[PDB]
Design a protein around this ligand. Structure first.
Ligand SMILES: *[C@@H]1O[C@H](CO)[C@@H](O[C@@H]2O[C@H](CO)[C@@H](O[C@@H]3O[C@H](CO[C@H]4O[C@H](CO)[C@@H](O)[C@H](O)[C@@H]4O)[C@@H](O)[C@H](O)[C@@H]3O)[C@H](O)[C@H]2NC(C)=O)[C@H](O)[C@H]1NC(C)=O
Ligand SMILES: *[C@@H]1O[C@H](CO)[C@@H](O[C@@H]2O[C@H](CO)[C@@H](O[C@@H]3O[C@H](CO[C@H]4O[C@H](CO)[C@@H](O)[C@H](O)[C@@H]4O)[C@@H](O)[C@H](O)[C@@H]3O)[C@H](O)[C@H]2NC(C)=O)[C@H](O)[C@H]1NC(C)=O
Ligand SMILES: *[C@@H]1O[C@H](CO)[C@@H](O[C@@H]2O[C@H](CO)[C@@H](O[C@@H]3O[C@H](CO[C@H]4O[C@H](CO)[C@@H](O)[C@H](O)[C@@H]4O)[C@@H](O)[C@H](O)[C@@H]3O)[C@H](O)[C@H]2NC(C)=O)[C@H](O)[C@H]1NC(C)=O
Ligand SMILES: *[C@H]1O[C@H](CO)[C@@H](O)[C@H](O)[C@H]1O
Ligand SMILES: *[C@H]1O[C@H](CO)[C@@H](O)[C@H](O)[C@H]1O
Ligand SMILES: *[C@H]1O[C@H](CO)[C@@H](O)[C@H](O)[C@H]1O
Lengths: 356, 356, 356
């Protein structure tokens, strides 16, 4: 009976699964896109507009004749936002004061505006990159991450309050038999969440000849999963009660990737299938002489990409891919913003040069 | 007796603990804040000062009348450092030569100085950010990290030479009983270091009915831990002798976070407490029929934050948080410095434009 | 016989080894050095050349008199590339059009060129840093990584098609005895690849009293490794057939470092040597009463650096060190390139200022 499923035989599998289950109902921060540079650029646009002729200001759709000019079409919303911001009480005075241009002669206003031309041209692509980053990463949010991870763990597309429910944990609820419920990657794939995987790898079936405590001796299996997982919820509660795992905060792509890699290194191939958990014979039925496992039906080395298409695996992968991008773009945005704030400071100094 | 504590029953716990114990007496490099930009900025300040009027130079506390001017108050130490540096033999000549301003006419000196105004204004916030980074990360040092990690592993706040000593490894030395010494997170928390955790999870008690080799069959337990851990040091020596772990270098936040996450995923909850190591009944006493473990008294899922307040856990967390910041700030500083060096090169070119 | 080598006794060692073996025949992307800034700089050089005098253009070795001028020596290839690019049909017209300098008066051409002086001087060190990064990281390629990792796993310095072959997996082929083949770090070091390590830790010897299934019960050992590993290949095939591991993509330094750290934390020291896999007595012979392991002969805590000199360990370390550098330099290059593109946009705006 060492070859049967005994207490602790799935203990090490359980540790990896526990780490994954701790991704449920997650409250993480995400890497911050530093968008302070956008305000700095807007401030420069407001200075430029303030220093413009009464004819140019009168303009604030581009007007007939420029409706089709590619520069006017791109700049219009930017100019419109600047004009609107400038209308606010004391805002133009403040803009001019910061620039050293309060009560400036017209000669100086014009020279100062012209001086801004290269500065604005240098800042434009920096600002446009920052605005692109912002847009590209706008779905990397704590909420979106939490929902995707709750789909992975519990099959529930919600930010919080996710709980074990077989209707969600197994795709279309539990099958007619445990053997069929504990299959994934196959034509009738059922064990499509981390929680279903835990049930398959750890449950105590009713009726005797069970593998109670396969996932650890500290589980208090107070009930059982019924026959054919009919009442898996009570048993899952007892199993998951033993899990204390917490992921690092903020959550990183690297951590998620390491967790998926850890699972992949535990799956074992036999007879044309892959298995997570102890498999002896027949199938993943919850019987001690058979197996307490997930059967990745027809999974093989050359078809391992199919593991990554299983819903929980795909959801976690999507989150990691989003975080991988956002981590880099956040670091880039720090510098873009600092540079734009520096351009704003430069624009505020040009009058000093020109007076002198 | 499979449910008793047998040889190897804590082997996998030991591997994770070994990785943590290898953080003792650590000699790591830390991410470098690239401060070369500060010198570049100083060089620009020296050029600006060199090109100033004899009246401005005569000034080198701001003088009566400017003592309260916010710009003079901020710039004074910078200007003072520039003036001091310029006094050094041949330094002003070298500054002027690099700028193409040796023997420059007064007209050109003045125009060149004015040209510097926007350049200096752009560089100022870049330099101030770099100086802020430097200050914010000045305690992320190999020494500070080593001391915090030695507190974590051995309870000894020192850079090197940390060793097992029960007076330090257990908070206030060992308790009256093993059961009480092998508790953490509770009103009389004792097992507050990684080394105490290893003792609790791995020791061979005297008097028979011990769990020798729970942490691995290659341990040569040549002695024992005494009764109630009275002579734990000799036994700890034999246990730790089997540990070969090395962390990656340079040490990273990610690695530390992964190690704490790995421990968290191993702690098992039963009867209102958490346990690391095999627990059967009664307590973590070192007796084979009872347990060889740490009891995280009253630890539960909803109170898991309390695990992170345990001294060794907090120390490692602090180190990881420091490294997480410094990794990012180091990457930012690379670009800040390159930009400041480029500004210096730009300042050295303005005379060529103005001559022509 | 719990102290003998039984089925599953090396299962956890095998999971870590499987993760390492999955580095064979790897197809990863590497962090991209963003070199778009180099083209941007070239465009600026072409604008500068276009705006130069017919005397300066006539020049396109520096000419007699400037052959030794440090500026001319550095700039010559850059200027030569610019002149060559400008000769291409319509290229000069396009350069001038982008700059607003089509049909520009000579006065404006000259003023515009002079305006470029500080811009080019600021861009020069940014471009030179980017070109340095490019050169420093030019061997961090998918091909080079794949070859080094195939040396690590299979001892075959090739990009793809690496397979088990004892002539390559063991240094100089298998030794006269398993005990001697399963040694590393010593005067006659043999087990110098991950695959040799797997053979040593997992093989089924012929002749009875073997430790079949030490690395897991799902292995179908259809044959055996012969006597003294004489036919290890067939047996290795059956063992590795059970391994499904995939590393994260793109491959990271952190992942590689974590994998080497994981192995280091598993090696156990006894009797002056280190061991990976279960060791009871005598040596790593494949006999159940002796050991199924690699013997790191004379490895000790103070000599653990010697583990990192073992060929597979060194190869993976080299890859991680290369990736660690390239990850950082890639992130730096993103900003260098954005800045150079912004300088190009600035250069294209100077005529607008000067006309006005
Ligand atoms: C900063 O404020 C400036 C105004 O003070 C903005 O300058 C305007 O910028 C656009 C380029 O996007 C130029 O558009 C060109 O216009 C000519 C035709 O110019 C004539 O008509 C306009 C409109 O009545 C008038 O403003 C001019 O003086 C001329 O009478 C076209 O042939 C080009 O294709 C292009 O459309 C404007 O000419 C220019 N105006 C002035 C007065 O400089 C500037 O864009 C602001 N900067 C930024 C970055 O937003
Ligand atoms: C580069 O070197 C310059 C000197 O060659 C520095 O310029 C000085 O910078 C401060 C701004 O921080 C200006 O302070 C203003 O001063 C006026 C009063 O100015 C009169 O008095 C000063 C002192 O006797 C004299 O230098 C001026 O010519 C005037 O006679 C105040 O009303 C302002 O609130 C502010 O305090 C200096 O005026 C300015 N001096 C000159 C000659 O330009 C410059 O700061 C250095 N750049 C950097 C970045 O450090
Ligand atoms: C942008 O294009 C410019 C040409 O339009 C390039 O300017 C040339 O740049 C080099 C600096 O690397 C200067 O070299 C100096 O030359 C003087 C001697 O100058 C006299 O002879 C040259 C050659 O016949 C002639 O071009 C000058 O007008 C003078 O008659 C030396 O004493 C210095 O040590 C140094 O060698 C050139 O003078 C300069 N030429 C002009 C016309 O400005 C410029 O380098 C290009 N920019 C970049 C970044 O590539
Ligand atoms: C588990 O239960 C099945 C179903 O009765 C039985 O066939 C096995 O022998 C038992 O271990
Ligand atoms: C460990 O030691 C205790 C104390 O004598 C005993 O109660 C247990 O039965 C033994 O295993
Ligand atoms: C493994 O094989 C060796 C060689 O015959 C023997 O000495 C051991 O007793 C056996 O377990």
């Amino acid at each position: 009976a060492a070859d049967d499923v005994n207490p602790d035989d799935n203990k090490e599998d359980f540790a990896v699964l526990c780490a994954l289950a701790a991704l449920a109902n997650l409250q993480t921060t995400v890497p911050s896109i530093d968008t302070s540079g956008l305000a700095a650029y807007d401030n420069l646009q407001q200075l430029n507009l303030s220093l413009s002729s009464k004819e140019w200001k009168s303009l604030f759709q581009p007007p007939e004749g420029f409706q089709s000019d590619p520069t006017w079409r791109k700049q219009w919303p930017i100019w419109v936002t600047a004009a609107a911001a400038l209308k606010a009480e004391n805002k133009e005075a403040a803009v001019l004061a910061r620039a050293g241009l309060t009560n400036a002669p017209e000669e100086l206003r014009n020279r100062a505006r012209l001086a801004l031309i290269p500065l604005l041209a240098q800042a434009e692509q920096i600002r446009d990159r920052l605005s692109e980053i912002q847009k590209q990463n706008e779905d990397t949010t704590p909420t979106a991450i939490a929902k995707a991870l709750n789909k992975a763990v519990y099959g529930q597309d919600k930010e919080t309050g996710a709980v074990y429910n077989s209707a969600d944990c197994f795709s279309g609820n539990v099958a007619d038999s445990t053997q069929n419920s504990c299959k994934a990657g196959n034509q009738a794939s059922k064990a499509t969440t981390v929680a279903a995987t835990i049930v398959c790898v750890c449950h105590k079936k009713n009726g005797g000849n069970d593998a109670a405590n396969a996932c650890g001796r500290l589980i208090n299996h107070q009930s059982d999963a019924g026959a054919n997982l009919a009442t898996a919820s009570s048993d899952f509660g007892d199993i998951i009660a033993t899990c204390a795992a917490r992921p690092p905060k903020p959550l990183t792509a690297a951590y998620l990737d390491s967790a998926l890699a850890a699972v992949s290194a535990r799956i074992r191939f036999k007879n044309g299938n892959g298995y997570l958990g102890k498999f002896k014979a027949t199938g993943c039925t919850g019987s001690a002489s058979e197996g307490l496992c997930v059967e990745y039906t027809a999974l093989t080395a050359a078809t391992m990409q199919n593991f990554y298409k299983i819903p929980w695996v795909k959801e976690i992968s999507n989150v990691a891919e989003a975080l991988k991008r956002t981590e880099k773009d956040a670091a880039e945005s720090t510098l873009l913003s600092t540079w734009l704030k520096a351009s704003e400071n430069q624009g505020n100094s040009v009058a000093q040069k020109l007076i002198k």
